[PDB]
Amino acid sequence: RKPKTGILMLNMGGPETLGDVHDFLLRLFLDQDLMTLPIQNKLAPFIAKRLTPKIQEQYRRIGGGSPIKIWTSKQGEGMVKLLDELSPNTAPHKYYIGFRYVHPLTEEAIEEMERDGLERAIAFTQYPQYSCSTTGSSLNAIYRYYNQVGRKPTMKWSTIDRWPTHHLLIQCFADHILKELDHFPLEKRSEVVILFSAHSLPMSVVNRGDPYPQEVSATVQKVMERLEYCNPYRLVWQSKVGPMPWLGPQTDESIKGLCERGRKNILLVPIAFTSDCIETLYELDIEYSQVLAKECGVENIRRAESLNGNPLFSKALADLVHSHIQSNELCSKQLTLSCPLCVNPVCRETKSFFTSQQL
Amino acid sequence: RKPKTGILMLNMGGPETLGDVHDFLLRLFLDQDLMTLPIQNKLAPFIAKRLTPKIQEQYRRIGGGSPIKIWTSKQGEGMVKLLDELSPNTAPHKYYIGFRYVHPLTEEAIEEMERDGLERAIAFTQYPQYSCSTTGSSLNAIYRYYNQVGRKPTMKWSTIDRWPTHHLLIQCFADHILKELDHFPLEKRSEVVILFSAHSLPMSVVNRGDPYPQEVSATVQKVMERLEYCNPYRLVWQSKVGPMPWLGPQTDESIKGLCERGRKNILLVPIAFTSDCIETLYELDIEYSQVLAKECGVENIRRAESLNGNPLFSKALADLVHSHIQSNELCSKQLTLSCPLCVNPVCRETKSFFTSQQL
Ligand SMILES: C[C@H](CCC(=O)O)[C@H]1CC[C@H]2[C@@H]3[C@H](O)C[C@@H]4C[C@H](O)CC[C@]4(C)[C@H]3C[C@H](O)[C@]12C
Ligand SMILES: C[C@H](CCC(=O)O)[C@H]1CC[C@H]2[C@@H]3[C@H](O)C[C@@H]4C[C@H](O)CC[C@]4(C)[C@H]3C[C@H](O)[C@]12C
Ligand SMILES: C[C@H](CCC(=O)O)[C@H]1CC[C@H]2[C@@H]3[C@H](O)C[C@@H]4C[C@H](O)CC[C@]4(C)[C@H]3C[C@H](O)[C@]12C
Ligand SMILES: C[C@H](CCC(=O)O)[C@H]1CC[C@H]2[C@@H]3[C@H](O)C[C@@H]4C[C@H](O)CC[C@]4(C)[C@H]3C[C@H](O)[C@]12C
Ligand SMILES: C[C@H](CCC(=O)O)[C@H]1CC[C@H]2[C@@H]3[C@H](O)C[C@@H]4C[C@H](O)CC[C@]4(C)[C@H]3C[C@H](O)[C@]12C
Ligand SMILES: C[C@H](CCC(=O)O)[C@H]1CC[C@H]2[C@@H]3[C@H](O)C[C@@H]4C[C@H](O)CC[C@]4(C)[C@H]3C[C@H](O)[C@]12C
Ligand code: FES
Ligand code: FES
Numbered sequence: 001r002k003p004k005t006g007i008l009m010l011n012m013g014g015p016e017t018l019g020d021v022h023d024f025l026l027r028l029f030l031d032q033d034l035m036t037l038p039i040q041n042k043l044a045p046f047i048a049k050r051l052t053p054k055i056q057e058q059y060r061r062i063g064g065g066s067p068i069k070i071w072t073s074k075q076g077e078g079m080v081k082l083l084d085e086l087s088p089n090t091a092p093h094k095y096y097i098g099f100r101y102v103h104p105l106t107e108e109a110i111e112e113m114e115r116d117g118l119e120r121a122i123a124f125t126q127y128p129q130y131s132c133s134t135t136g137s138s139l140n141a142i143y144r145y146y147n148q149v150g151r152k153p154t155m156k157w158s159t160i161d162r163w164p165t166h167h168l169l170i171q172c173f174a175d176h177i178l179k180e181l182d183h184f185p186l187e188k189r190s191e192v193v194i195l196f197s198a199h200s201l202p203m204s205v206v207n208r209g210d211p212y213p214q215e216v217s218a219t220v221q222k223v224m225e226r227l228e229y230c231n232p233y234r235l236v237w238q239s240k241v242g243p244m245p246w247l248g249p250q251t252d253e254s255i256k257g258l259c260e261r262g263r264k265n266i267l268l269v270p271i272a273f274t275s276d277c278i279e280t281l282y283e284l285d286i287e288y289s290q291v292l293a294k295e296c297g298v299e300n301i302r303r304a305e306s307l308n309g310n311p312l313f314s315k316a317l318a319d320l321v322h323s324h325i326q327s328n329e330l331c332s333k334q335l336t337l338s339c340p341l342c343v344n345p346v347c348r349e350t351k352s353f354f355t356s357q358q359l
Numbered sequence: 360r361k362p363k364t365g366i367l368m369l370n371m372g373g374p375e376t377l378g379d380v381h382d383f384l385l386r387l388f389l390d391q392d393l394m395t396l397p398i399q400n401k402l403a404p405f406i407a408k409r410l411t412p413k414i415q416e417q418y419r420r421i422g423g424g425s426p427i428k429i430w431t432s433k434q435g436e437g438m439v440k441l442l443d444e445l446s447p448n449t450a451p452h453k454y455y456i457g458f459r460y461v462h463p464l465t466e467e468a469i470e471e472m473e474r475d476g477l478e479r480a481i482a483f484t485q486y487p488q489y490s491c492s493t494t495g496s497s498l499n500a501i502y503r504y505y506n507q508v509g510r511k512p513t514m515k516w517s518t519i520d521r522w523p524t525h526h527l528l529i530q531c532f533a534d535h536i537l538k539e540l541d542h543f544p545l546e547k548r549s550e551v552v553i554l555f556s557a558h559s560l561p562m563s564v565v566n567r568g569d570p571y572p573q574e575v576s577a578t579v580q581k582v583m584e585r586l587e588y589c590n591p592y593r594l595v596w597q598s599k600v601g602p603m604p605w606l607g608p609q610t611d612e613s614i615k616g617l618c619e620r621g622r623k624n625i626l627l628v629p630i631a632f633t634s635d636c637i638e639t640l641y642e643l644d645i646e647y648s649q650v651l652a653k654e655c656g657v658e659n660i661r662r663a664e665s666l667n668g669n670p671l672f673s674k675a676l677a678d679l680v681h682s683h684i685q686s687n688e689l690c691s692k693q694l695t696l697s698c699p700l701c702v703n704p705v706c707r708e709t710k711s712f713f714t715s716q717q718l
Binding site (some may be wrong): 218 | 471565567570574590591594595604606608616622692694697698707
């Protein structure tokens with residue numbers, strides 16, 4: 001009955017209520033792995049306070065908070081139930097949520113796992129495609145926790161640091177895309193253009209060698225092959241903020257561009273998220289699909305449902321862990337190679353932390 | 360006996376001798392599809408002249424000329440030999456080379472195809488990954504040829520505008536990668552880091568929605584899957600020129616970056632080319648693998664052999680054409696969707712030229 005194998009589900013997380021917004025932003029602006037700011041300890045809390053109002057408003061517009069925890073929990077539960085049957089030898093299994101900027105924090109999760117006296121610990125990022133700013137930071141967090149708690153782990157660690165083309169993940173996306181195409185007016189099904197939308201990155205991060213763009217592109221190709229290229233598409237990027245150069249084309253500008261050129265039936269696909277979040281419920285659904293779409297005279301714009309509670313996604317999670325345990329993988333081969341132009345000394349240390357694990 | 364089906368092999372081409380360098384550049388700077396310059400008719404010849412000496416020197420350093428035509432010819436021959444046996448209904452088959460900036464020019468080829476009284480004409484781009492500046496411009500040249508010659512085609516046209524993941528193309532790359540790995544000292548085989556190198560694009564082109572990046576990424580993923588992720592990798596871009604922002608990371612900077620970070624065994628892979636060219640024999644082999652490599656302290660840097668005369672590549676070409684004929688494809692579904700921010704009015708017209716083709 002005592003938990004044996006723990007599955008740490010890593011994700012950035014999102015504020016559950018409006019009151020959680022400020023601290024969310026604060027923890028984020030204090031993360032060196034994500035950004036280096038002048039007098040950061042002073043500006044971090046300041047920027048957080050000045051952005052809180054506007055960000056609280058965005059969450060109010062979607063109902064008052066982020067559903068990430070809810071969806072993550074349901075996905076974890078399904079995953080566990082399947083693992084206890086798939087791998088009796090490693091059962092019982094228990095999932096732990098390790099959010100990067102909100103409770104339960106990555107550090108609180110690890111602390112709970114250590115107290116539960118697990119034998120095996122698996123860092124399972126929830127970002128199918130790897131980015132040093134997301135999965136990397138989350139993995140860095142695990143290494144720093146021990147390096148700071150002044151004591152070696154009491155569990156055997158390993159990590160599933162990426163999984164951009166897992167067949168069940170691809171199937172989930174393909175299934176959701178198809179059912180959504182069925183929602184368009186019959187007369188426009190074939191005319192529908194698919195815009196796969198992933199989170200954009202500043203060009204400064206892309207240019208240092210971030211793995212993200214290339215992996216996201218792989219997921220896209222995999223999904224389209226499964227769809228037998230029934231509709232034309234383009235991979236675009238959303239969430240750019242600030243005046244600096246980011247990887248484009250931008251999702252909003254692409255939507256507007258398509259309309260001005262006669263392609264008024266668009267299908268958006270949140271290809272790099274596993275559940276609804278502010279990026280889908282507000283940015284894509286309200287900001288672009290309601291406001292922008294109107295001004296551009298779109299005829300039909302829809303978004304494929306987020307993976308959320310699809311039972312197939314949980315199976316995907318279970319299959320990944322199961323196959324990870326069976327192969328004795330400590331981490332992907334990809335993690336053993338840091339960005340050619342990486343300037344963060346912790347990246348190499350985090351890699352070694354995992355590649356060096358006993359077992 | 361007389362040719363029935365003609366396969367137009369499209370490629371930019373390269374100057375065969377140092378003397379061909381000037382006109383090569385001249386034709387290129389005069390292509391509106393590739394770039395728009397102020398007083399272009401006056402500047403094109405001027406720029407061509409000022410770059411000629413440096414570019415001629417580059418070709419001198421690799422032996423005095425570009426091997427693109429020789430390799431294209433051999434590949435076309437193998438393709439035809441196979442098609443005459445694979446698709447008897449469409450035989451005899453004949454291949455025609457349509458270089459965009461050197462003889463035989465795309466226009467000269469079409470002219471010859473007409474004169475041969477072919478029944479079927481297939482525009483077969485030799486760029487597996489689609490870019491509006493390469494395949495797009497080449498397809499644009501075909502539409503413009505008829506629109507300016509004031510006459511409708513006398514052959515039924517169609518196009519294989521892309522093939523980033525054809526399984527035989529993938530095996531060819533995977534095969535050349537493996538045998539190149541066998542050339543590294545055994546002790547360092549597993550330490551080898553793979554740098555897939557593709558031609559970079561200016562961000563202005565990337566941001567308007569160019570299909571290139573995403574498709575190149577697909578080829579990389581497929582190849583790595585076939586290699587079962589034996590070595591870690593990163594997709595980088597070469598050939599940036601000028602001071603404007605281009606899509607990185609840059610191949611030269613990545614090589615240098617890897618070295619100063621302790622990864623001194625590098626394998627370069629020209630993932631977006633089908634034969635050797637100045638980009639491989641000079642840029643990668645001399646500029647990077649000899650000069651840059653020396654100054655950086657590399658232990659071992661090699662480059663997977665270009666597809667060139669590999670019989671499997673010819674097979675790939677033949678099967679692509681075969682399947683294309685069997686399915687009645689006029690063009691890919693992707694060609695029916697122009698870039699969201701396309702500003703070239705001819706792109707839409709070229710697309711219609713193919714989608715509206717009789718039969
Ligand atoms: C200089 C630094 C960016 C450094 C870099 O990576 O080049 C930027 C990032 C966020 C900026 C701050 C945020 O925009 C918040 C404030 C905005 C005000 O207009 C100036 C002060 C202000 C406090 C800015 C100071 C400075 O320009 C910051 C700190
Ligand atoms: C740009 C960066 C990712 C960089 C990278 O991948 O290298 C992402 C990670 C988390 C993001 C931030 C978080 O989502 C929190 C804020 C969300 C707001 O909608 C925009 C500002 C906001 C402050 C975001 C700015 C930017 O998009 C961040 C900082
Ligand atoms: C827009 C916001 C400041 C808002 C404000 O002044 O109220 C600032 C604060 C910190 C900034 C980020 C950090 O400077 C880190 C990154 C710096 C890059 O040059 C752009 C992306 C980058 C991710 C920035 C995006 C954006 O401009 C941020 C998120
Ligand atoms: C202005 C234009 C780029 C416009 C654009 O992309 O927005 C650039 C493209 C190529 C440039 C030219 C080429 O670099 C060749 C010449 C270089 C000299 O240093 C200036 C004149 C010169 C003749 C340049 C004039 C101008 O800056 C040009 C014509
Ligand atoms: C940048 C452009 C592709 C743009 C795009 O994909 O949109 C490519 C296509 C052909 C290229 C040019 C041709 O290769 C001819 C020249 C080759 C030299 O090594 C650099 C200058 C040179 C003049 C190249 C400049 C640039 O890289 C070009 C113009
Ligand atoms: C470098 C070369 C001029 C060389 C010279 O004057 O000696 C110039 C001439 C035309 C330029 C190109 C054209 O301006 C078209 C493109 C403009 C984009 O802003 C950069 C890429 C882009 C493809 C340019 C690359 C490069 O700067 C070129 C090729
Ligand atoms: S920034 Fe990518 S490994 Fe360090
Ligand atoms: S520039 Fe891409 S279709 Fe016109």
